[PDB]
Design a protein around this ligand. Structure first.
Ligand SMILES: */C(=C\C(=O)N1CCCC[C@@H](n2c(NC(=O)c3ccnc(C)c3)nc3cccc(C)c32)C1)CN(C)C
Length: 290
């Protein structure tokens, strides 16, 4: 009911230089680019994401992105209204945490793993405060700014609630039972996804329910079957994931409490995660351009 005073910044085609192509898929095309804000005398490294139905959707993704401000959520720097709609957002130099955990398995420590968990839990709790259900929380949708700093992305599904959301193609494997069965989406349904996300990291990017068709997941979870205990996980950690995968959504841990546990755990990570051998000129990062 609070009026959304977020400002939407329109950018000049000329204001920024499109460098390389970070990636092209179903979601669209992402480009590595530089943004020079006119008289500003700053260079901002950015990522530029590029039909009326297509244009409608991208703008709603912009509406959500502009309305958020958190050290653990991807920021919209502005939009460019050309022949095509482009979202200009802070460049995350290390891409998605999924590829990162996959590509750096042998050098990823328990301290990092446990902190990533805090950082996600934090962001998710911010989106909770902002009455916004993510609906698509995965390790692929969590970007790496620095290995010491991760931020939540992909607000294409994000739904801003007011005073259980009722709903296209969907993940299934990160989805909660009620979401699969009844398209009921809540912050606690995001807790399920967070649990799954943790499982992805503790397995160093293992595919959830590998070799199981999505049409089977429904009955599987109804039967009481869940994702197994990742080898690096002490029972203390696996229990947290197991609490996210409860049938009663009120029995799922609150994001504010997951922040607590994971922080307690990151105060001594080796007790909780058992990993083998655990022991150009005027450039400014967006996080410093306010
Ligand atoms: C995860 C895919 C993956 O790692 N990316 C997600 C989408 C494509 C871009 C890619 N990428 C970026 N992205 C951003 O900087 C960015 C910033 C803000 N919002 C968005 C949506 C994107 N930056 C990158 C730097 C280096 C390499 C790459 C690839 C990169 C990240 C796994 N997939 C399932 C394969």
């Amino acid at each position: 009911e609070a009026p959304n005073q977020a400002l939407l910044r329109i950018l000049k085609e000329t204001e920024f230089k499109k460098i390389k192509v970070l990636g092209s898929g179903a979601f669209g095309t992402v480009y590595k680019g530089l943004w020079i804000p006119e008289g500003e005398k700053v260079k901002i490294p950015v990522a530029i994401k590029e039909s009326p139905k297509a244009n409608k959707e991208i703008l709603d993704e912009a509406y959500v992105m502009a309305s958020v401000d958190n050290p653990h959520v991807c920021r919209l720097l502005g939009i460019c209204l050309t022949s095509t709609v482009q979202l200009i957002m802070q460049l995350m130099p290390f891409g998605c945490l999924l590829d990162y955990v996959r590509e750096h398995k042998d050098n990823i420590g328990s301290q990092y793993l446990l902190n990533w968990c805090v950082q996600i839990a934090k962001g998710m709790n911010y989106l909770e405060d902002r009455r916004l259900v993510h609906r698509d929380l995965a390790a692929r949708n969590v970007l790496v700014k620095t290995p010491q700093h991760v931020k939540i992305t992909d607000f294409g599904l994000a739904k801003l609630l007011g005073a259980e959301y009722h709903a296209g193609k969907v993940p299934i494997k990160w989805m909660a039972l009620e979401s699969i069965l009844h398209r009921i989406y809540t912050h606690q349904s995001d807790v399920w996804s967070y649990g799954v996300t943790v499982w992805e990291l503790m397995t160093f990017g293992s595919k959830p329910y590998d070799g199981i068709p999505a049409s089977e997941i429904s009955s599987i979870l109804e039967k009481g079957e869940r994702l197994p205990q990742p080898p690096i996980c002490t029972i203390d950690v696996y229990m947290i994931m197991v609490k996210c995968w409860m049938i009663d959504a009120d029995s799922r841990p609150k994001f504010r409490e997951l922040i607590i546990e994971f922080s307690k755990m990151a105060r001594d990570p080796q007790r909780y995660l058992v990993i083998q051998g655990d022991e150009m000129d005027d450039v400014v990062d967006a996080d410093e351009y306010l």
